[PDB]
Ligand binder design. Structure first.
Ligand SMILES: Cc1ccc(F)cc1C(N)=O
Length: 209
């Protein structure tokens, strides 16, 4: 059972701008997704300070980067607070409408796309490198869900019957054919060292056979 939703017009406009604007510095998508994972990990950590049972779904707080050249996917996994179904539908827990408005004004006022994270909509930078994004998520207060979009104005939400996650979020980037450099170990290592060297959670880059 799959539900299909329209993006709000402003979010569709943001995604088309990200997809259609010529901009070579695409690597910042990974910084933005790792920063989102760090924010989600901070949230479950804070909740656990006064209620340790919040970590019954998993005590480890970490970020995994999983490249798969056979599937042409880069997956960013975190054990953060996750997202409810309502969060997913509401632009993946962001204030994306007002964030997009602030971002697009900054662009005609001298800012550039690499600054997207300052406006709370860094998730959508995934579409710099991905033709399709799948988000698997599990929040303590809801069931496991799969969000997915290939842009084009719509996204889907369904209950996820896949591998149980415990708690957190998995962002699966189905990479564009010409963006496979982001599956190479040395390229991922370089980006993490350049942009994410001070993230306060272990970032583990998985290797492939
Ligand atoms: C350069 C760029 C790419 C994508 C985007 F969404 C915005 C911009 C910008 N800085 O105007």
């Amino acid at each position: 059972e799959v539900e299909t939703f329209a993006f709000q017009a402003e979010i569709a406009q943001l995604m088309s701008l990200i997809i259609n604007t010529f901009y070579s510095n695409k690597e910042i998508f990974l910084r933005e997704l790792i920063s989102n994972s760090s924010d989600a990990l901070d949230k479950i950590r804070y909740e656990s300070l006064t209620d340790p049972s919040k970590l019954d779904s998993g005590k480890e707080l970490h970020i995994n980067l999983i490249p798969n050249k056979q599937d042409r996917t880069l997956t960013i996994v975190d054990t953060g607070i996750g997202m409810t179904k309502a969060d997913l539908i509401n632009n993946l827990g962001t204030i994306a409408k007002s964030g997009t408005k602030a971002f697009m004004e900054a662009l005609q006022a001298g800012a550039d796309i690499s600054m997207i994270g300052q406006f709370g909509v860094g998730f959508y930078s995934a579409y710099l490198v991905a033709e399709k994004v799948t988000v698997i998520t599990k929040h303590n207060d809801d069931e496991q869900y799969a969000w997915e979009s290939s842009a084009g104005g719509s996204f889907t939400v369904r209950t996820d019957t896949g591998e149980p996650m415990g708690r957190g979020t998995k962002v699966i980037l189905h990479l564009k054919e010409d963006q496979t450099e982001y599956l190479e170990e040395r390229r991922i290592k370089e980006i993490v060292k350049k942009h994410s060297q001070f993230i306060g959670y272990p970032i583990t880059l998985f290797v492939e056979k």
